[PDB]
Design a protein around this ligand. Structure first.
Ligand SMILES: Cc1cc2c(cc1C)N(C[C@H](O)[C@H](O)[C@H](O)COP(=O)(O)OP(=O)(O)OC[C@H]1O[C@@H](n3cnc4c(N)ncnc43)[C@H](O)[C@@H]1O)c1[nH]c(=O)[nH]c(=O)c1N2
Ligand SMILES: CC(C)=CCC/C(C)=C/CC/C(C)=C/CC/C(C)=C/COP(=O)(O)OP(=O)(O)O
Ligand SMILES: CC(C)=CCC/C(C)=C/CC/C(C)=C/CC/C(C)=C/COP(=O)(O)OP(=O)(O)O
Length: 452
Protein backbone atom coordinates (compact mmCIF):
# COMPACT_ATOMS: atom_id res chain seq x y z
CA UNK A 1 0.00 0.00 0.00
CA UNK A 2 0.93 3.68 -0.28
CA UNK A 3 3.20 5.03 2.46
CA UNK A 4 3.30 8.64 3.64
CA UNK A 5 5.44 10.39 6.25
CA UNK A 6 4.24 13.11 8.61
CA UNK A 7 5.69 14.70 11.74
CA UNK A 8 2.44 14.32 13.67
CA UNK A 9 -0.67 12.20 13.11
CA UNK A 10 -3.78 13.40 14.94
CA UNK A 11 -6.57 10.83 15.17
CA UNK A 12 -9.97 12.40 15.80
CA UNK A 13 -11.21 15.90 15.04
CA UNK A 14 -13.30 16.74 18.09
CA UNK A 15 -12.61 19.60 20.49
CA UNK A 16 -9.48 17.75 21.61
CA UNK A 17 -8.00 16.89 18.22
CA UNK A 18 -8.89 20.16 16.50
CA UNK A 19 -7.37 22.24 19.30
CA UNK A 20 -4.21 20.14 19.06
CA UNK A 21 -4.10 20.76 15.31
CA UNK A 22 -4.74 24.47 15.81
CA UNK A 23 -2.07 24.91 18.49
CA UNK A 24 0.49 22.92 16.48
CA UNK A 25 -0.06 24.80 13.21
CA UNK A 26 2.47 27.14 11.57
CA UNK A 27 5.39 25.98 13.72
CA UNK A 28 7.55 24.04 11.29
CA UNK A 29 5.82 20.66 11.47
CA UNK A 30 4.05 18.53 8.86
CA UNK A 31 0.70 17.55 10.38
CA UNK A 32 -2.15 15.25 9.34
CA UNK A 33 -5.49 15.00 11.14
CA UNK A 34 -8.05 12.30 10.34
CA UNK A 35 -11.66 11.74 11.40
CA UNK A 36 -14.15 9.01 10.49
CA UNK A 37 -17.01 11.48 10.12
CA UNK A 38 -17.66 13.59 7.01
CA UNK A 39 -16.67 17.25 7.43
CA UNK A 40 -20.22 18.55 7.91
CA UNK A 41 -20.79 16.15 10.80
CA UNK A 42 -17.48 16.54 12.65
CA UNK A 43 -18.19 17.53 16.25
CA UNK A 44 -21.80 16.34 16.43
CA UNK A 45 -21.35 13.81 19.24
CA UNK A 46 -24.32 14.17 21.64
CA UNK A 47 -23.37 16.94 24.05
CA UNK A 48 -24.86 19.69 26.20
CA UNK A 49 -22.79 22.17 24.16
CA UNK A 50 -22.17 24.31 27.26
CA UNK A 51 -18.65 25.69 27.68
CA UNK A 52 -17.26 28.32 30.05
CA UNK A 53 -15.91 31.51 28.46
CA UNK A 54 -12.81 31.35 30.68
CA UNK A 55 -11.59 28.29 28.77
CA UNK A 56 -11.44 30.25 25.51
CA UNK A 57 -9.54 33.18 27.03
CA UNK A 58 -6.87 31.12 28.78
CA UNK A 59 -5.80 29.14 25.71
CA UNK A 60 -6.00 31.96 23.19
CA UNK A 61 -8.74 30.04 21.41
CA UNK A 62 -10.99 31.93 18.95
CA UNK A 63 -14.31 33.00 20.49
CA UNK A 64 -17.44 31.36 19.08
CA UNK A 65 -19.23 33.95 16.94
CA UNK A 66 -22.26 34.15 14.67
CA UNK A 67 -24.14 30.89 14.15
CA UNK A 68 -21.54 29.12 16.30
CA UNK A 69 -22.87 30.96 19.35
CA UNK A 70 -26.52 30.01 19.81
CA UNK A 71 -27.07 31.45 23.29
CA UNK A 72 -25.09 33.51 25.81
CA UNK A 73 -24.94 32.07 29.32
CA UNK A 74 -24.67 34.31 32.39
CA UNK A 75 -25.08 31.75 35.16
CA UNK A 76 -26.42 28.46 36.51
CA UNK A 77 -29.47 27.64 38.65
CA UNK A 78 -28.95 24.54 40.80
CA UNK A 79 -32.15 22.87 42.04
CA UNK A 80 -32.47 20.64 45.11
CA UNK A 81 -34.25 17.23 44.89
CA UNK A 82 -37.44 18.62 46.50
CA UNK A 83 -37.23 21.71 44.26
CA UNK A 84 -37.34 23.88 47.39
CA UNK A 85 -33.81 25.33 47.37
CA UNK A 86 -32.36 27.01 44.29
CA UNK A 87 -28.73 28.13 44.24
CA UNK A 88 -27.66 30.77 41.72
CA UNK A 89 -24.09 30.64 40.43
CA UNK A 90 -23.00 33.46 38.11
CA UNK A 91 -20.38 33.20 35.38
CA UNK A 92 -20.14 33.85 31.65
CA UNK A 93 -20.39 30.91 29.28
CA UNK A 94 -21.57 29.82 25.85
CA UNK A 95 -24.25 27.53 24.46
CA UNK A 96 -22.57 26.35 21.28
CA UNK A 97 -23.44 25.00 17.90
CA UNK A 98 -20.64 22.51 18.57
CA UNK A 99 -20.21 21.16 15.03
CA UNK A 100 -20.11 24.66 13.51
CA UNK A 101 -17.44 25.90 15.91
CA UNK A 102 -15.45 22.65 15.73
CA UNK A 103 -15.40 22.81 11.93
CA UNK A 104 -14.14 26.41 11.98
CA UNK A 105 -11.23 25.46 14.25
CA UNK A 106 -10.44 22.68 11.77
CA UNK A 107 -10.89 24.98 8.77
CA UNK A 108 -8.57 27.59 10.27
CA UNK A 109 -5.98 24.94 11.14
CA UNK A 110 -6.21 23.76 7.54
CA UNK A 111 -5.57 27.32 6.40
CA UNK A 112 -2.52 27.33 8.67
CA UNK A 113 -0.93 24.39 6.85
CA UNK A 114 -2.52 21.42 8.60
CA UNK A 115 -3.78 18.61 6.36
CA UNK A 116 -7.21 17.18 7.17
CA UNK A 117 -8.79 13.98 5.84
CA UNK A 118 -12.46 13.40 6.65
CA UNK A 119 -14.23 10.05 6.22
CA UNK A 120 -10.91 8.49 7.24
CA UNK A 121 -10.52 5.91 10.00
CA UNK A 122 -7.33 4.85 11.76
CA UNK A 123 -7.70 1.07 11.63
CA UNK A 124 -4.44 -0.43 12.88
CA UNK A 125 -1.66 1.06 15.02
CA UNK A 126 1.83 0.81 13.57
CA UNK A 127 3.78 -0.42 16.57
CA UNK A 128 7.40 -1.31 15.79
CA UNK A 129 10.57 -1.54 17.90
CA UNK A 130 8.64 -0.69 21.07
CA UNK A 131 7.33 2.61 19.69
CA UNK A 132 4.11 3.92 18.22
CA UNK A 133 5.18 4.90 14.70
CA UNK A 134 1.91 5.74 12.97
CA UNK A 135 -1.24 4.02 11.75
CA UNK A 136 -2.99 2.28 8.87
CA UNK A 137 -5.70 4.60 7.57
CA UNK A 138 -8.74 3.98 5.38
CA UNK A 139 -9.85 6.96 3.29
CA UNK A 140 -13.21 5.85 1.91
CA UNK A 141 -13.56 9.11 -0.01
CA UNK A 142 -10.80 7.80 -2.27
CA UNK A 143 -11.26 4.17 -1.19
CA UNK A 144 -7.56 4.00 -0.29
CA UNK A 145 -5.88 2.04 2.49
CA UNK A 146 -2.83 4.13 3.38
CA UNK A 147 0.05 3.55 5.78
CA UNK A 148 1.04 6.77 7.52
CA UNK A 149 4.25 7.08 9.54
CA UNK A 150 4.65 9.71 12.24
CA UNK A 151 7.03 10.63 15.05
CA UNK A 152 4.11 11.31 17.40
CA UNK A 153 0.54 10.02 17.28
CA UNK A 154 -2.07 12.17 19.03
CA UNK A 155 -4.87 9.86 20.16
CA UNK A 156 -8.07 11.93 20.39
CA UNK A 157 -10.67 9.33 19.43
CA UNK A 158 -13.17 10.28 22.13
CA UNK A 159 -14.80 7.92 24.62
CA UNK A 160 -14.39 5.00 22.21
CA UNK A 161 -10.57 5.20 22.59
CA UNK A 162 -10.58 3.05 19.47
CA UNK A 163 -6.90 3.45 18.62
CA UNK A 164 -4.91 3.10 21.85
CA UNK A 165 -7.09 0.17 22.93
CA UNK A 166 -5.58 -1.78 20.03
CA UNK A 167 -2.07 -1.24 21.43
CA UNK A 168 -0.22 -3.85 23.56
CA UNK A 169 -1.70 -4.05 27.10
CA UNK A 170 1.76 -3.65 28.68
CA UNK A 171 1.77 0.01 27.66
CA UNK A 172 0.53 2.34 30.44
CA UNK A 173 -1.14 4.34 27.67
CA UNK A 174 -3.70 1.54 27.26
CA UNK A 175 -5.18 2.08 30.73
CA UNK A 176 -8.87 1.20 30.52
CA UNK A 177 -11.97 2.72 32.12
CA UNK A 178 -13.79 1.24 35.12
CA UNK A 179 -17.59 1.16 34.73
CA UNK A 180 -18.20 3.14 37.92
CA UNK A 181 -15.74 5.82 36.76
CA UNK A 182 -18.09 6.90 33.97
CA UNK A 183 -21.60 8.23 33.38
CA UNK A 184 -23.96 7.28 30.58
CA UNK A 185 -25.60 10.47 29.35
CA UNK A 186 -28.47 11.26 26.99
CA UNK A 187 -29.93 14.50 25.61
CA UNK A 188 -32.51 15.96 23.23
CA UNK A 189 -32.92 19.39 21.65
CA UNK A 190 -36.51 20.59 21.26
CA UNK A 191 -38.44 23.80 20.64
CA UNK A 192 -40.57 25.08 23.52
CA UNK A 193 -44.27 25.96 23.48
CA UNK A 194 -43.69 29.09 25.56
CA UNK A 195 -40.65 31.36 25.71
CA UNK A 196 -37.96 30.29 28.18
CA UNK A 197 -37.80 32.22 31.46
CA UNK A 198 -34.24 33.39 32.21
CA UNK A 199 -32.92 31.79 29.03
CA UNK A 200 -29.45 33.14 29.80
CA UNK A 201 -29.34 30.77 32.78
CA UNK A 202 -28.69 27.03 32.81
CA UNK A 203 -30.81 24.79 35.03
CA UNK A 204 -29.22 21.83 36.80
CA UNK A 205 -31.43 19.47 38.81
CA UNK A 206 -29.99 17.18 41.47
CA UNK A 207 -32.05 14.07 42.26
CA UNK A 208 -30.72 10.61 43.09
CA UNK A 209 -34.01 9.00 42.05
CA UNK A 210 -34.48 10.55 38.61
CA UNK A 211 -30.78 10.55 37.73
CA UNK A 212 -28.72 8.47 40.20
CA UNK A 213 -25.02 9.30 40.21
CA UNK A 214 -25.51 12.34 38.00
CA UNK A 215 -28.13 15.01 37.35
CA UNK A 216 -30.74 16.44 34.98
CA UNK A 217 -30.14 19.56 32.89
CA UNK A 218 -32.12 22.26 31.10
CA UNK A 219 -29.79 24.24 28.84
CA UNK A 220 -31.49 26.97 26.75
CA UNK A 221 -30.11 27.37 23.22
CA UNK A 222 -32.32 30.39 22.62
CA UNK A 223 -35.60 31.97 23.68
CA UNK A 224 -37.57 28.96 22.46
CA UNK A 225 -35.02 26.14 22.15
CA UNK A 226 -33.50 24.00 24.90
CA UNK A 227 -30.99 21.17 25.36
CA UNK A 228 -32.54 18.87 27.95
CA UNK A 229 -31.07 15.60 29.20
CA UNK A 230 -29.48 13.67 32.05
CA UNK A 231 -26.57 11.50 33.15
CA UNK A 232 -26.40 8.51 35.48
CA UNK A 233 -23.46 6.57 36.93
CA UNK A 234 -22.47 3.43 35.02
CA UNK A 235 -21.68 -0.02 36.40
CA UNK A 236 -24.33 0.21 39.12
CA UNK A 237 -27.01 -1.98 37.56
CA UNK A 238 -29.31 0.93 36.74
CA UNK A 239 -31.87 0.38 33.95
CA UNK A 240 -31.53 2.01 30.50
CA UNK A 241 -31.00 5.77 30.69
CA UNK A 242 -33.79 6.33 28.16
CA UNK A 243 -36.19 4.87 30.73
CA UNK A 244 -35.21 7.62 33.17
CA UNK A 245 -35.53 10.24 30.43
CA UNK A 246 -38.99 9.19 29.27
CA UNK A 247 -40.29 8.88 32.82
CA UNK A 248 -39.11 12.21 34.25
CA UNK A 249 -38.90 14.55 31.24
CA UNK A 250 -42.15 16.36 32.04
CA UNK A 251 -40.91 17.17 35.54
CA UNK A 252 -37.86 19.11 34.34
CA UNK A 253 -39.19 20.17 30.93
CA UNK A 254 -42.99 20.60 30.81
CA UNK A 255 -42.72 23.43 28.29
CA UNK A 256 -41.02 21.55 25.44
CA UNK A 257 -42.89 20.75 22.23
CA UNK A 258 -42.30 17.03 21.73
CA UNK A 259 -43.44 17.35 18.12
CA UNK A 260 -40.53 19.70 17.43
CA UNK A 261 -37.56 17.45 18.21
CA UNK A 262 -34.35 18.53 16.48
CA UNK A 263 -31.72 16.03 17.63
CA UNK A 264 -31.50 13.14 20.09
CA UNK A 265 -29.05 10.52 21.33
CA UNK A 266 -26.56 9.70 24.04
CA UNK A 267 -22.99 8.63 24.76
CA UNK A 268 -20.51 7.67 27.49
CA UNK A 269 -18.84 10.29 29.70
CA UNK A 270 -15.65 9.65 31.71
CA UNK A 271 -15.86 11.00 35.27
CA UNK A 272 -12.46 10.47 36.84
CA UNK A 273 -8.84 11.57 37.12
CA UNK A 274 -7.01 11.57 33.76
CA UNK A 275 -4.81 8.73 32.48
CA UNK A 276 -1.95 8.16 34.92
CA UNK A 277 0.18 9.05 31.93
CA UNK A 278 -1.15 10.76 28.82
CA UNK A 279 2.16 10.23 27.05
CA UNK A 280 4.31 7.29 26.05
CA UNK A 281 6.77 6.24 23.34
CA UNK A 282 5.59 7.95 20.16
CA UNK A 283 2.09 8.71 21.41
CA UNK A 284 0.05 11.26 23.37
CA UNK A 285 -3.59 10.80 24.42
CA UNK A 286 -6.01 13.71 24.88
CA UNK A 287 -9.71 14.44 25.35
CA UNK A 288 -12.21 11.81 26.51
CA UNK A 289 -9.76 9.14 25.37
CA UNK A 290 -7.42 10.38 28.10
CA UNK A 291 -10.27 10.95 30.58
CA UNK A 292 -9.97 14.75 30.61
CA UNK A 293 -13.54 15.31 31.82
CA UNK A 294 -14.53 17.19 34.99
CA UNK A 295 -15.54 14.41 37.43
CA UNK A 296 -18.20 16.51 39.19
CA UNK A 297 -20.24 18.35 36.54
CA UNK A 298 -19.14 16.23 33.57
CA UNK A 299 -17.92 19.13 31.45
CA UNK A 300 -15.11 18.05 29.15
CA UNK A 301 -14.99 20.30 26.08
CA UNK A 302 -13.05 23.05 27.83
CA UNK A 303 -10.56 20.62 29.31
CA UNK A 304 -10.26 18.81 25.98
CA UNK A 305 -8.96 22.04 24.47
CA UNK A 306 -6.54 22.30 27.40
CA UNK A 307 -5.25 18.79 26.72
CA UNK A 308 -4.76 19.71 23.06
CA UNK A 309 -2.78 22.77 24.12
CA UNK A 310 -0.49 20.69 26.33
CA UNK A 311 -0.14 18.12 23.55
CA UNK A 312 1.13 20.81 21.18
CA UNK A 313 3.60 22.14 23.75
CA UNK A 314 5.00 18.69 24.54
CA UNK A 315 5.36 17.73 20.88
CA UNK A 316 7.25 20.93 20.01
CA UNK A 317 9.61 20.21 22.90
CA UNK A 318 10.13 16.67 21.62
CA UNK A 319 11.23 17.89 18.19
CA UNK A 320 13.66 20.37 19.75
CA UNK A 321 15.33 17.48 21.58
CA UNK A 322 14.89 14.78 18.94
CA UNK A 323 13.37 12.71 21.73
CA UNK A 324 10.00 11.08 21.06
CA UNK A 325 10.16 8.63 23.96
CA UNK A 326 7.77 8.90 26.89
CA UNK A 327 10.54 10.87 28.59
CA UNK A 328 10.77 13.23 25.63
CA UNK A 329 7.01 13.84 25.67
CA UNK A 330 6.68 13.87 29.46
CA UNK A 331 5.91 17.60 29.55
CA UNK A 332 2.44 16.60 28.34
CA UNK A 333 1.69 15.22 31.80
CA UNK A 334 3.31 18.06 33.75
CA UNK A 335 1.46 20.71 31.73
CA UNK A 336 -2.00 19.14 31.87
CA UNK A 337 -1.78 18.14 35.53
CA UNK A 338 -0.99 21.74 36.51
CA UNK A 339 -3.65 23.10 34.16
CA UNK A 340 -6.55 20.75 34.98
CA UNK A 341 -5.36 17.28 35.98
CA UNK A 342 -4.67 18.05 39.64
CA UNK A 343 -8.17 19.51 39.88
CA UNK A 344 -9.72 16.39 38.33
CA UNK A 345 -8.02 14.12 40.85
CA UNK A 346 -9.40 16.11 43.78
CA UNK A 347 -12.84 16.25 42.14
CA UNK A 348 -12.65 12.50 41.50
CA UNK A 349 -12.69 11.98 45.26
CA UNK A 350 -15.40 14.59 45.82
CA UNK A 351 -17.60 12.97 43.16
CA UNK A 352 -17.50 9.63 44.97
CA UNK A 353 -18.73 11.39 48.11
CA UNK A 354 -21.47 13.29 46.26
CA UNK A 355 -22.81 10.23 44.43
CA UNK A 356 -23.43 8.42 47.72
CA UNK A 357 -25.44 11.23 49.33
CA UNK A 358 -29.20 10.78 49.67
CA UNK A 359 -31.83 13.28 48.52
CA UNK A 360 -32.45 14.07 52.20
CA UNK A 361 -28.77 14.95 52.65
CA UNK A 362 -28.74 17.19 49.58
CA UNK A 363 -32.05 18.81 50.55
CA UNK A 364 -30.69 19.51 54.03
CA UNK A 365 -27.28 20.70 52.85
CA UNK A 366 -28.71 23.17 50.34
CA UNK A 367 -31.54 24.51 52.51
CA UNK A 368 -29.21 25.00 55.48
CA UNK A 369 -26.49 26.46 53.24
CA UNK A 370 -23.61 24.30 54.48
CA UNK A 371 -21.47 25.96 51.82
CA UNK A 372 -22.08 29.20 49.92
CA UNK A 373 -22.58 29.41 46.16
CA UNK A 374 -19.33 31.39 46.18
CA UNK A 375 -17.39 28.68 48.00
CA UNK A 376 -18.96 26.12 45.68
CA UNK A 377 -17.46 27.88 42.65
CA UNK A 378 -14.03 27.62 44.28
CA UNK A 379 -14.58 23.86 44.57
CA UNK A 380 -15.59 23.45 40.92
CA UNK A 381 -12.92 25.69 39.40
CA UNK A 382 -9.81 25.07 41.50
CA UNK A 383 -10.79 21.68 42.89
CA UNK A 384 -10.17 22.97 46.40
CA UNK A 385 -12.44 22.31 49.36
CA UNK A 386 -10.70 24.56 51.88
CA UNK A 387 -10.35 23.12 55.38
CA UNK A 388 -11.82 26.34 56.78
CA UNK A 389 -14.86 25.93 54.53
CA UNK A 390 -15.27 22.28 55.52
CA UNK A 391 -15.10 23.22 59.21
CA UNK A 392 -17.77 25.86 58.62
CA UNK A 393 -19.99 23.22 57.02
CA UNK A 394 -19.33 20.64 59.75
CA UNK A 395 -20.65 23.11 62.33
CA UNK A 396 -23.96 23.24 60.45
CA UNK A 397 -24.04 19.47 59.87
CA UNK A 398 -23.69 19.05 63.65
CA UNK A 399 -27.28 20.28 63.92
CA UNK A 400 -28.47 17.14 62.15
CA UNK A 401 -29.88 14.55 64.55
CA UNK A 402 -30.03 11.62 62.13
CA UNK A 403 -27.30 9.35 60.71
CA UNK A 404 -25.88 10.77 57.47
CA UNK A 405 -22.86 10.59 55.17
CA UNK A 406 -22.61 14.37 55.57
CA UNK A 407 -20.70 13.87 58.83
CA UNK A 408 -17.67 12.72 56.83
CA UNK A 409 -17.28 15.97 54.88
CA UNK A 410 -14.16 17.02 56.79
CA UNK A 411 -12.48 13.68 56.05
CA UNK A 412 -13.42 14.14 52.40
CA UNK A 413 -11.82 17.60 52.31
CA UNK A 414 -8.64 16.13 53.77
CA UNK A 415 -8.56 13.36 51.17
CA UNK A 416 -9.12 15.86 48.36
CA UNK A 417 -6.29 17.96 49.76
CA UNK A 418 -4.04 14.90 49.98
CA UNK A 419 -4.50 13.65 46.42
CA UNK A 420 -4.14 17.24 45.21
CA UNK A 421 -0.64 17.50 46.67
CA UNK A 422 0.14 14.06 45.25
CA UNK A 423 -0.69 15.20 41.71
CA UNK A 424 1.19 18.47 42.16
CA UNK A 425 4.11 16.18 42.94
CA UNK A 426 3.63 14.27 39.68
CA UNK A 427 6.73 12.19 38.74
CA UNK A 428 9.41 14.10 36.84
CA UNK A 429 10.42 11.02 34.83
CA UNK A 430 8.59 7.91 33.52
CA UNK A 431 10.69 5.70 35.82
CA UNK A 432 8.75 7.03 38.82
CA UNK A 433 5.31 6.40 37.30
CA UNK A 434 4.64 2.98 38.80
CA UNK A 435 5.53 4.10 42.32
CA UNK A 436 3.43 7.26 42.06
CA UNK A 437 0.48 5.43 40.49
CA UNK A 438 0.34 2.86 43.30
CA UNK A 439 0.37 5.66 45.86
CA UNK A 440 -2.62 7.26 44.14
CA UNK A 441 -4.47 3.94 44.10
CA UNK A 442 -3.84 3.58 47.83
CA UNK A 443 -5.39 6.99 48.50
CA UNK A 444 -8.46 6.07 46.46
CA UNK A 445 -8.90 2.52 47.76
CA UNK A 446 -8.56 3.88 51.30
CA UNK A 447 -11.10 6.63 50.60
CA UNK A 448 -13.67 4.21 49.18
CA UNK A 449 -13.54 2.29 52.46
CA UNK A 450 -13.98 5.45 54.55
CA UNK A 451 -17.38 6.10 52.94
CA UNK A 452 -18.72 3.03 54.74
C1 LIG B 1 -24.71 13.71 26.50
C2 LIG B 1 -23.44 14.46 26.82
C3 LIG B 1 -23.51 15.75 27.32
C4 LIG B 1 -22.37 16.49 27.60
C5 LIG B 1 -21.11 15.90 27.38
C6 LIG B 1 -21.03 14.60 26.89
C7 LIG B 1 -22.18 13.88 26.60
C8 LIG B 1 -22.06 12.48 26.04
N1 LIG B 1 -19.96 16.66 27.68
C9 LIG B 1 -18.61 16.10 27.47
C10 LIG B 1 -18.07 16.47 26.10
O1 LIG B 1 -19.09 16.27 25.11
C11 LIG B 1 -16.85 15.62 25.76
O2 LIG B 1 -16.06 15.44 26.93
C12 LIG B 1 -15.96 16.22 24.67
O3 LIG B 1 -16.76 16.53 23.52
C13 LIG B 1 -14.83 15.29 24.30
O4 LIG B 1 -14.11 15.81 23.15
P1 LIG B 1 -13.21 14.82 22.31
O5 LIG B 1 -12.74 15.54 21.10
O6 LIG B 1 -12.16 14.13 23.18
O7 LIG B 1 -14.24 13.69 21.88
P2 LIG B 1 -15.16 13.54 20.59
O8 LIG B 1 -15.97 12.31 20.72
O9 LIG B 1 -15.93 14.85 20.43
O10 LIG B 1 -14.14 13.33 19.41
C14 LIG B 1 -13.92 12.02 18.85
C15 LIG B 1 -13.70 12.19 17.38
O11 LIG B 1 -12.75 11.20 16.92
C16 LIG B 1 -13.25 10.56 15.77
N2 LIG B 1 -12.72 9.20 15.75
C17 LIG B 1 -12.93 8.21 16.67
N3 LIG B 1 -12.32 7.08 16.40
C18 LIG B 1 -11.65 7.35 15.21
C19 LIG B 1 -10.81 6.57 14.40
N4 LIG B 1 -10.49 5.30 14.67
N5 LIG B 1 -10.29 7.14 13.29
C20 LIG B 1 -10.61 8.41 13.02
N6 LIG B 1 -11.40 9.25 13.71
C21 LIG B 1 -11.89 8.65 14.80
C22 LIG B 1 -14.77 10.64 15.88
O12 LIG B 1 -15.36 10.55 14.59
C23 LIG B 1 -14.95 12.02 16.51
O13 LIG B 1 -15.03 13.06 15.54
C24 LIG B 1 -20.07 18.01 27.90
N7 LIG B 1 -18.93 18.77 27.92
C25 LIG B 1 -19.02 20.12 28.11
O14 LIG B 1 -18.05 20.86 27.97
N8 LIG B 1 -20.25 20.61 28.48
C26 LIG B 1 -21.47 19.98 28.31
O15 LIG B 1 -22.51 20.63 28.32
C27 LIG B 1 -21.32 18.58 28.10
N9 LIG B 1 -22.44 17.79 28.07
C1 LIG C 1 -24.21 18.28 30.86
C2 LIG C 1 -22.83 17.78 31.20
C3 LIG C 1 -22.52 16.30 31.17
C4 LIG C 1 -21.88 18.66 31.53
C5 LIG C 1 -22.20 20.14 31.57
C6 LIG C 1 -20.97 20.88 32.01
C7 LIG C 1 -21.36 22.26 32.48
C8 LIG C 1 -22.12 22.46 33.77
C9 LIG C 1 -21.00 23.31 31.71
C10 LIG C 1 -21.33 24.72 32.10
C11 LIG C 1 -20.30 25.61 31.45
C12 LIG C 1 -20.78 27.03 31.42
C13 LIG C 1 -21.48 27.60 30.21
C14 LIG C 1 -20.58 27.79 32.52
C15 LIG C 1 -21.05 29.23 32.58
C16 LIG C 1 -21.51 29.55 33.98
C17 LIG C 1 -20.37 29.57 34.97
C18 LIG C 1 -20.64 29.50 36.46
C19 LIG C 1 -19.10 29.65 34.53
C20 LIG C 1 -17.93 29.65 35.48
O1 LIG C 1 -16.77 29.80 34.69
P1 LIG C 1 -16.04 31.18 34.82
O2 LIG C 1 -16.42 32.07 33.66
O3 LIG C 1 -14.54 31.01 34.85
O4 LIG C 1 -16.54 31.78 36.19
P2 LIG C 1 -16.24 33.23 36.72
O5 LIG C 1 -17.51 34.04 36.78
O6 LIG C 1 -15.64 33.12 38.10
O7 LIG C 1 -15.25 33.90 35.79
C1 LIG D 1 -22.34 14.75 40.54
C2 LIG D 1 -23.64 14.90 41.31
C3 LIG D 1 -24.23 13.64 41.90
C4 LIG D 1 -24.33 16.05 41.54
C5 LIG D 1 -24.15 17.53 41.19
C6 LIG D 1 -23.01 18.01 40.30
C7 LIG D 1 -22.76 19.48 40.65
C8 LIG D 1 -22.85 19.93 42.08
C9 LIG D 1 -22.47 20.39 39.70
C10 LIG D 1 -22.23 21.84 40.09
C11 LIG D 1 -22.25 22.73 38.86
C12 LIG D 1 -21.21 23.81 39.05
C13 LIG D 1 -21.15 24.54 40.37
C14 LIG D 1 -20.36 24.13 38.05
C15 LIG D 1 -19.31 25.21 38.25
C16 LIG D 1 -19.32 26.23 37.11
C17 LIG D 1 -18.49 25.81 35.91
C18 LIG D 1 -19.05 24.85 34.89
C19 LIG D 1 -17.25 26.35 35.75
C20 LIG D 1 -16.32 26.06 34.58
O1 LIG D 1 -16.02 24.69 34.44
P1 LIG D 1 -14.50 24.26 34.44
O2 LIG D 1 -14.20 23.49 33.18
O3 LIG D 1 -14.26 23.37 35.63
O4 LIG D 1 -13.58 25.55 34.46
Amino acid sequence: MKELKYDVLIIGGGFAGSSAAYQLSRRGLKILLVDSKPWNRIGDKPCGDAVSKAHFDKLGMPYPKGEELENKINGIKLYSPDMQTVWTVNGEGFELNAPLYNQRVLKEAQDRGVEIWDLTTAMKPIFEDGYVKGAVLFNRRTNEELTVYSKVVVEATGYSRSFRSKLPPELPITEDLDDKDADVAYREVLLTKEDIEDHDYLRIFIDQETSPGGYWWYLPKGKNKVNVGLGIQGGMGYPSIHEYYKKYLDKYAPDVDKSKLLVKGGALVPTRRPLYTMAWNGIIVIGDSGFTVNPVHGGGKGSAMISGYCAAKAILSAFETGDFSASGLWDMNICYVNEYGAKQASLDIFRRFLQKLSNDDINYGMKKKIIKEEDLLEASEKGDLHLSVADKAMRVISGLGRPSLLFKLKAVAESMKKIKELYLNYPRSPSSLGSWRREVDNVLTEFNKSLS
